[PDB]
Amino acid sequence: GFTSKDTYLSHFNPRDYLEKYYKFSAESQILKHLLKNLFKIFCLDGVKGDLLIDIGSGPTIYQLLSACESFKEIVVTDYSDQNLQELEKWLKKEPAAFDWSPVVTYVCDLEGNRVKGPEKEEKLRQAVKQVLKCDVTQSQPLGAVPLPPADCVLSTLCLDAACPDLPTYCRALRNLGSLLKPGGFLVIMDALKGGREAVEAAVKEAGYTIEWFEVIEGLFSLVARKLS
Ligand SMILES: Cc1ccc2c(c1)cc([C@H]1C[C@H](n3ccnc3CN)CN1C(=O)c1cnc3[nH]ccc3c1)n2Cc1ccc(Cl)cc1
């Protein structure tokens, strides 16, 4: 049930999935829980800095909506071109882009209705600085792009999309660490697909210290810091 780089394919039609799962019953419920958790990480728990890199963004922006409260600069990334195109239609405010309005409104509600949808959308659009290819199996997952050491790497539902075996996952997390300052944050929100202990081993062996781990089969979230 594992995927390797030689077997990986992402959904060819990312738009149909946005329409199905990101329009918000079971899926709406799960998305709400994710969004509440991301609110806590990025607006309460001290995960903040200048530069966040979202690894394996997929075609979605919901995982960045609270994060742009806490990071001036966000880089979104994906191995597959069709996911990057779906992101760019939205960032560039094209008429053909997915309508993230309902989710955006819901996040504005979680944040106390300090702003309305358009203002929140604009804050995210201003924060997203680059849209790039990544390959987590590479020592330099973003290739030659000369980003400075970042404050946070976020990975959401990546195991959920395709699960590598444990040493491959540990190596990916260690490759992602090359993107982080010492002490930089690693935030993972994903599917348990050896369970919690396997995730914890991969995180620790990839050179991070877990601050906390929460169950939110099943979904978890965790925040770790790269060894300092
Ligand atoms: C630390 C981490 C671990 C696993 C990850 C990710 C991060 C990110 C993803 C994948 C899945 C993710 N996705 C696609 C649709 N929705 C989501 C989640 N938002 C996008 N996306 C990638 O952009 C990606 C990155 N680099 C790669 N190199 C070879 C394939 C490949 C895919 N994997 C799935 C995956 C499975 C097996 C293998 Cl060997 C490698 C990756």
- Ligand 1 near 156 CB (within 6 A): yes
Tell me how far apart the alpha carbons of residues 102 and 88 are, in angstroms, rounded to a whole number: 19
Is 178 within 8 Å of 147 (Cβ atoms)? no
What is the number of domains present in the chain? 1
Q: Quickly list DSSP for 152-175.
A: EEEEESHHHH----HHHHHHHHHH
- Could you list the residue range(s) of the whole structural domain that residue 193 is in? 1-228
- Ligand 1 near 187 CB (within 6 A): no
CB burial readout 125-163, b (16+ within 10 A) else e: eebbeebbebbbeeeebbeeeeeeebbbbbbbbbbebbb
Ligand 1, residues 10, 57, 79: which to mutate, most atoms within 8 A of Cβ? Answer: 79
Beta strands in 79-135 (DSSP E): 128-133
Is 62 within 8 Å of 87 (Cβ atoms)? no
Q: Which amino acid is at 46?
A: G
Tell me how far apart the alpha carbons of residues 161 and 189 are, in angstroms, rounded to a whole number: 12
For this entry, resolution in Å reads 1.8
Return the ligand 1 atom nearest residue 136 CA.
Answer: 26
Strand 219-226 to strand 180-191: parallel, antiparallel, or no bridges (unpaired)?
antiparallel
